[PDB]
């Protein structure tokens, strides 16, 4: 009974990691959007230098 409870507790924690904000998919979007901005702004910077 204790081990079966632990299975539910591990599923509840996994669900919290998937359902929260500040999750994997937000950071993936942040990386892609920032990388595109970073390369465009580098092209502008080097033109200015």
Partner 1 sequence: INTDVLGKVFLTKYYMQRYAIHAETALILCNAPISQRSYDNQPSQFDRLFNTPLLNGQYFSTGDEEIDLNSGSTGDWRKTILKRAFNIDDVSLFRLLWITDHDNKDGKIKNNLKNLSNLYIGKLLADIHQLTIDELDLLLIAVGEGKTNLSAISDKQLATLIRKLNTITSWLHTQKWSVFQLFIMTSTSYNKTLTPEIKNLLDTVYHGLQGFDKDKADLLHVMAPYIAATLQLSSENVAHSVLLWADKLQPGDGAMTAEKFWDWLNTKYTPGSSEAVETQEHIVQYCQALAQ
Partner 2 sequence: LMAEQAYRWELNDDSARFIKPGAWQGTYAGLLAGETLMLSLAQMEDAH
Partner 3 sequence: LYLPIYATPADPKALLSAAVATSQGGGWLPESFMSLWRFPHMLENARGMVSQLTQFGSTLQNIIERQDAEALNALLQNQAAELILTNLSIQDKTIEEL
CA distance 26 to 1: 37
Contact segment (CB under 8 A) with partner 2 among 3-11, 12-20, 33-41 equals 33-41
User: Which positions from 22 through 41 interact with partner 3, judged by CB under 8 A?
Assistant: 22-25, 27-28, 30-31, 34-35, 37-38, 41
- The C-alpha atoms of residue 20 and residue 16 are separated, in whole angstroms, by 6
Per CB under 8 A, 33 contacts partner 1: yes
Report, in Å, the least distance between residue 4 CB and partner 3: 7
Q: Are 17 and 23 in contact (CB under 8 A)?
A: yes
């Amino acid at each position: 009974t204790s081990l079966k409870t632990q299975q539910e507790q591990t599923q509840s924690q996994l669900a919290f990691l998937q359902r929260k904000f500040s999750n994997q998919a937000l950071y993936n979007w942040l990386r892609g959007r920032l990388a595109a901005i970073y390369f465009q702004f580098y092209d502008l910077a080097v033109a200015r230098c």
